[PDB]
Design an enzyme around this catalytic site. Structure first.
Site, mmCIF file in Angstrom:
data_model
loop_
_atom_site.group_PDB
_atom_site.id
_atom_site.type_symbol
_atom_site.label_atom_id
_atom_site.label_comp_id
_atom_site.label_asym_id
_atom_site.label_seq_id
_atom_site.Cartn_x
_atom_site.Cartn_y
_atom_site.Cartn_z
ATOM 1 N N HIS A 93 0.814 -1.205 0.000
ATOM 2 C CA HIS A 93 0.000 0.000 0.000
ATOM 3 C C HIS A 93 0.852 1.262 0.000
ATOM 4 C CE1 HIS A 93 0.211 1.838 4.040
ATOM 5 N NE2 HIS A 93 0.323 0.611 4.518
ATOM 6 N N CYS A 94 0.430 2.201 -0.836
ATOM 7 C CA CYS A 94 1.031 3.521 -0.986
ATOM 8 C C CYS A 94 0.057 4.321 -1.817
ATOM 9 C CB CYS A 94 2.458 3.516 -1.608
ATOM 10 S SG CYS A 94 2.849 2.041 -2.597
ATOM 11 N N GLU A 95 -1.094 4.666 -1.268
ATOM 12 C CA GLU A 95 -1.989 5.365 -2.152
ATOM 13 C C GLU A 95 -1.567 6.783 -2.411
ATOM 14 O OE1 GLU A 95 -4.705 4.511 -4.213
ATOM 15 O OE2 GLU A 95 -3.746 2.564 -3.818
#
Ligand SMILES: [Cl-]
Length: 171
Positions: A93-95
């Site tokens: 995750h790394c929005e």
């Protein structure tokens, strides 16, 4: 639905629709199911890969997540000495852009294929957390630490953003 990366079995987690049709996304509830051990009889180990920049991670991340924003560090942490087991699952995750998450997910698969005889893999099952930290935090704040949220574009970290960008392999 297709089998996992090494075609040994089905994906374990229920998925949700995400931007990339070919990637597997999970919801915050599913992430909590993992964290609370609902899959402990099947999942031996899972790693939450937070690929946001350090200042973002420091301002609030999911408990036990590992900050691996640089491809070389993610590769080193995951593939120098493969975390073997039951299943092993990775959640990335790394929005909020430049497709960090999807890119890291694809990069790790690329490197995993490269160090294995097809179709074997060290990490055959990988998912993306739908909505990233931004959508997770307001749902389960007590599974985060510290209990806060620092956006990539936080006005006070414009230079930290640039400083870190200059350490990436490509832009
Ligand atoms: Cl990088």
């Amino acid at each position: 639905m297709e089998l996992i990366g090494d075609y040994s079995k089905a994906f374990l987690l229920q998925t949700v629709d995400g931007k990339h049709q070919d990637l597997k996304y999970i919801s915050p509830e599913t992430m909590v199911a993992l964290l609370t051990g609902k899959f402990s009889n099947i999942v031996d180990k899972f790693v939450i890969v937070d690929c946001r920049y350090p200042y973002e991670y420091e301002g609030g991340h999911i408990k036990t997540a590992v900050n691996l924003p640089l491809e070389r560090d993610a590769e080193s942490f995951l593939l120098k000495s493969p975390i073997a087991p039951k299943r092993v699952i990775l959640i990335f995750h790394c929005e909020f852009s430049s497709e960090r998450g999807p890119r890291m997910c694809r990069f790790i698969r690329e490197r995993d294929r490269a160090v294995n005889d097809y179709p074997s893999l060290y990490y055959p099952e990988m998912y993306i957390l739908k909505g990233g930290y931004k959508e997770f935090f307001p749902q389960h704040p007590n599974f985060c630490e510290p209990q806060d949220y620092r956006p990539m574009n936080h006005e006070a970290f414009k230079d930290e953003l640039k400083t870190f960008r200059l350490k990436t392999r490509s832009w």
